[PDB]
Amino acid sequence: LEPFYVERYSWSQLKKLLADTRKAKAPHDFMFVKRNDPDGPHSDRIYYLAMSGENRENTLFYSEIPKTINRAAVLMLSWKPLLDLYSREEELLRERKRIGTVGIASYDYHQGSGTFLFQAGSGIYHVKDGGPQGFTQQPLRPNLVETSCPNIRMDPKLCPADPDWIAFIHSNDIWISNIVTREERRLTYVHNELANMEEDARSAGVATFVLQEEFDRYSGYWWCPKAETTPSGGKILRILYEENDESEVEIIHVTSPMLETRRADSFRYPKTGTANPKVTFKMSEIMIDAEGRIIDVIDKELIQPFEILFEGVEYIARAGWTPEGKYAWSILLDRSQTRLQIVLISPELFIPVEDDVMERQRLIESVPDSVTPLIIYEETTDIWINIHDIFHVFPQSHEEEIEFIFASECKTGFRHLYKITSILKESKYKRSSGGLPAPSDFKCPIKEEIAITSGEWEVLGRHGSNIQVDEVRRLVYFEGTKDSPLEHHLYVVSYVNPGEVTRLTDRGYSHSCCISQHCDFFISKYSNQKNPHCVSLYKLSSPEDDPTCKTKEFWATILDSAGPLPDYTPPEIFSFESTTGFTLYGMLYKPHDLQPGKKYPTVLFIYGGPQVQLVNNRFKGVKYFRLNTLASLGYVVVVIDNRGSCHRGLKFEGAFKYKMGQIEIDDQVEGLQYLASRYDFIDLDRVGIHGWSYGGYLSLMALMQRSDIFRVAIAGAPVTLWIFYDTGYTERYMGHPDQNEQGYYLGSVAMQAEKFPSEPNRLLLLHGFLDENVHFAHTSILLSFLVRAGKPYDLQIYPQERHSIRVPESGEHYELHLLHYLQENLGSRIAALKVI
Amino acid sequence: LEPFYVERYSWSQLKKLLADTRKAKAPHDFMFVKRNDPDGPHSDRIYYLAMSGENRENTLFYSEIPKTINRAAVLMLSWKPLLDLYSREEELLRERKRIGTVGIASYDYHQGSGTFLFQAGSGIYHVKDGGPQGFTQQPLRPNLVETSCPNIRMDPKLCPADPDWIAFIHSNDIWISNIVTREERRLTYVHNELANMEEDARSAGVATFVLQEEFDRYSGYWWCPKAETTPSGGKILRILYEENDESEVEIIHVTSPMLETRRADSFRYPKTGTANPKVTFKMSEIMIDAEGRIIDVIDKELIQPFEILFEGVEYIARAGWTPEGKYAWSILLDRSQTRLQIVLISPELFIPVEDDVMERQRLIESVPDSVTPLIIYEETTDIWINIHDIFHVFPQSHEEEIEFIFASECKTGFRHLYKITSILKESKYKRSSGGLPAPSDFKCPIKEEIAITSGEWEVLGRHGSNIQVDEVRRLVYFEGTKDSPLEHHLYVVSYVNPGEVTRLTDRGYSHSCCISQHCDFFISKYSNQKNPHCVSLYKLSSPEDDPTCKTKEFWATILDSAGPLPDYTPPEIFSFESTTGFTLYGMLYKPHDLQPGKKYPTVLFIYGGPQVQLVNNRFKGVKYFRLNTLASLGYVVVVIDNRGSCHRGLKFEGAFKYKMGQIEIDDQVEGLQYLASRYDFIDLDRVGIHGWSYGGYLSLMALMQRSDIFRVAIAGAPVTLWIFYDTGYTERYMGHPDQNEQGYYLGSVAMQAEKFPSEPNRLLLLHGFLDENVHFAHTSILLSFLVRAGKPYDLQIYPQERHSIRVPESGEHYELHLLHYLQENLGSRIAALKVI
């Protein structure tokens, strides 16, 4: 078997090749609104966010859903524009939400009035459509919400009880604004914008760093959905909000993007094993008169401290209100993230904030002892709680009961839907007796727990995946891996007598689906390895003999696929029975124009951390286009999902609990050795590895643990010390540093610098200089120990980049350097002559 | 001519070669004390700082100077130990003073009592020897100066008027302490140690960053040498001090050496074209009773503001008192550093600090209008003022006159000694009339200005070089370049009827000399290219017929040379007549074991900035040992002093005024082309360049301007934007940015990133990550523009290093990487095969 060597191009030639081979976000956030026009030809209008084309802002569009279609032809819904033609907190939110696009990122809608609310840059805007005032046939002018606030307004929400009122955050405090009267009012006085962040560490209505980065919670306040009528003809609007105190949280410095300043910005960063923010619940009570003017605002606090009413809770993972606004609900985690609670919180638990110790005691006594936190659900696990966005509360049927659907892996090790009924008993704890509550004084008895789904597959509840409940037919629509861990599909099931799960999406594609609130339509963004992404609308219907049974019918195209790219060869999905006892899936990019009797250099691209699956039946010709480019020059490219990756259940995910970095490369090498036994064109004497974040971390572990296998490792923004990473992520998978001294040591590449090769052209480190997620200190301290251990390294910095690469010139330089590095140190003939 | 290729060793082999080839500060700060022992065999005891041997702390030693010697034999003076067996402000001072050694860095001495004062780590210590109490024959126990101060005490000075009193700095305020009574007293209340540096930017008795880094001034307070007797039997001690306000000075962040913190330290850094600190003079008046107890301390300020009494002055370059303490003196610069003034300041210019506006006016009126600042000397230049340590005031002979020796380049363009007599006239400015002074109201008339030296050569007045004045014989001893710009020599001359300059040191060596206060002995640290450094004592004497004439005689050895190193071939000093009209000197390291008919790879080592001369007749086998190592592997090594380097006069130095970076590489290339025409073994198709600081700056300019000449450039801690460097240095050589837009642009490599090669393995950047002198931002912003211009680079960071390399593991890694980089990209056969 002859060694194939890649053509040795110059730096300028590789730049030109990359520019020539380089030469639009699909519609999303769908909403169905009924036309109610018996004589008219349309049943529904759909609204959605989309980019008008290749390079432009995201804006609001609408399309018309016809009552009937020509089933001979294919209907292309035309996009109608709904609308007429960054600060530091915007930049950081875009990092936390992983937003790459510009324009409207989300929108609020009040169905009763048809009021849209949305942020477009520095402005908060509103338009009206689909309400009682009817449906526009032309673009609407965005109405600017005027303000006296000097700084950026973030996170605007419409009051569901009254669409004249919005709330928003300004300098980490909650404000409200009436979009008819133009009354503007600050509700919380917790932060001072003039003060330094070392002095003022308090915020209201805001999700702090760990909850944006590690729990995908971006709001810290929630409108009560109903208003309380007053005897004066006015009403009371309520807002539940989280209040944070970050005083005890460590401050770290991250280089300012303005490099000319030679200054750093301060950041409240809870590193693993140190203090998370001090958190509590608060309620703002807004009294409004008959003509919509604010009478007074009463800020209210919990009758007893948060640490007493919610013993052992570190994180408020999720929160909201019950449908009729009777209770506030919250999903609460302990520090270990092995205990989840769903707790109902009555507004009667909140008393006015009072400094007068005489009046404060009068208010404490005015609240009954029967008013108590209600733990309606509590679960534990020896692996970890995976937080999700699934939680549905049915309308209150009986007085002292709550009926709800929740999802959990804790019973079977796979995420499944459960219908639960909890009894709201009076607690035997009485705070007037002047003691602390016993462990289970607020726990509710379970009247009923019914498994809706089950099996060796999971329901999805993150990244937009959720459920839709048909309360009439008593069905629940959900996304799952029931047919395959390589494809997401839409399913429907009864939650009354659960049994047969009907798949509503077509096999051979992975789907991401939105179901109409009216449960008679669904949209699917679908793709596979060979075909780029499409978006189609499907009408739902029941057979006349069985309303429980659901059928699908293609209705119209929303986005047409471009078709297979002219210059892209998709990879082949493969699999192998691992010695670990699991099927592990992989992707193989064969070198283009295979010559026989020749073995080729191999590049292993890796992530290998939790919360990600690289191998699945989706189109990889956009985000992983350059793996096809490597194959086009004569590199074998391999991707393998090792244990710890997602969509395979909690056991498979929990394989590296307490021992991150110790098991992943075994699977990666096992998959490489399986491939090389079946394929003789894989040269195992020229294997490179490359990844970003956890991928860069494992790229370093690969060269450290297995220099016998891996010639070169290119590690982007890698974790090198787990003590440097944050509480939410690190303690979930690795526990507290005191309870895992060996795991933290072995899992940290920087603590083992002397195990790297004493041989150059094998280790390349890449890092965004402004990275506030994986701090640059990970690289600088690894270099410190590499220099101290007399070890060679190559380094590239991206001075304008954080954790991701956003500036196209940085991306072009990264692709060019990496391609040139693989050529000179792995692929080319000169790379072979250099090895000593 | 065949190309010679260097042996291609592995990383591990080069590390071993460097370790095998790798396998003590000479005595300094000398002081002569007369024994006055007619019957005894010794005339003098000398005290000095030295390291006991190879690796140990610097401490105080003494040696005995015999009245007679055996002129047949060579006397080795034996070293007697005088003594019995870092904070952030210590680290930064060691950076500013370029101290590499540990232990006692300096010492104070009061001759009247024999009291030594010195700082050894966190302690201030005193011993007594050579006073009226006699001379020890054994080591003395250091007496700790006890304190209640919690933080490090810096810059301890003995009161010359009273050796019971010392002053020191603590948290940027002046304290005094009596080493007999143990009374301790804070004199200034200008700084709060508990406050953050953003809030409190004031200091007293301290030299700020630019004056430590760019003017070699490390103290900000000066004892008055005489005490004023009071009618009570007590006395008044005085301290002149500088008070600084850095409020308007820009704050920059430098990474903390504790990388685990991920924090940065704040630094007051006056970048070019921005505010220097607000400075003034202050006087502390300490009244002491008959038994040495403090009665009261009166802090005093100037009668009118500093900006009025010293119009146009930015920098207090130097300060002190006249011998009898009648006046304080100061050497003052304007911002452009083209105007120097020597100004006498009477204590009567200072009034008590008073808030009471009624009493303040009473004190202002109590001071006569005849009391005024006296400008005794003022000079200007169109190049720049070079500050030096030469300033001698003779004892006051007449009432309204001052007689002094100063040094200046402003008259002839070469630094020479001048004896000046100034008339202290009453100024016609009267402050009671309520106006501001006219430009020349404080200028004194020059009665007499006499050139003591002259010619195409300079007197030295920095880095320890100074004058010694024999007021009896009326001679002045000085160091100069009169015989050669490649050697420093000791000279003596009359300052009464100046004429013949007698050289007291032997040619064939460069000398650094200390003359006894008694002017009958001198010590020389001398070396040359072939012989490492020696230290010898020479007795001075006059012929019986002419006391003006001075002769030398070897007396004894202090430090014996080790002799020529066994594994070191010195370079050859060469020179060439430049097209610029100057002789330029160079150093050539021929490749070891020259083979004929073969051309070798060439490495040009460069500094090329102001204040440095690399080429001279000194031993280079210590600091530049690794240039010999490069020659031993087959590299031609070249060093050239381009225009702008020192020891050649102000015209030669002023060649790159306003155009730094534009002329240096022309000289370097001219010297290379001269060498290659005379020597055929120089391969001009394989030239590398390497330097640090200004050297790294010019290494980048070399690759940028002349990629036709230079294959590879390795730039350490380089200046890439002159706007990022400081006021004192940058504005001296380049002026204000507004007055030199093109010079700052062309002189900044980062503004011209698109002129670098689109060809890898040619540019290596090295930088200490903690560098507070040349900020790391120089490299990060250059990388930003290189990435944006699609240009390749190699990078090495030293995370534990500032501007210099102190940790030996960092130095070993730097030498190993550089040697390996030259092998792989310039010297070896593989380096030739790689070029596309």
Ligand SMILES: *[B]([O])([O])[C]1[C][C][C]N1C(=O)[C]([N])[C]([C])[C]
């Ligand atoms: B990287 O994988 O993007 C980085 C290192 C570990 C986790 N992480 C993250 O950015 C995020 N905290 C998770 C949620 C992927």
Ligand SMILES: *[B]([O])([O])[C]1[C][C][C]N1C(=O)[C]([N])[C]([C])[C]
């Ligand atoms: B480097 O040459 O050490 C650096 C860049 C320009 C001047 N400089 C200095 O460190 C110092 N400020 C001078 C005094 C050498």
Ligand code: NA
């Ligand atoms: Na996130």
Ligand code: NA
């Ligand atoms: Na200095």
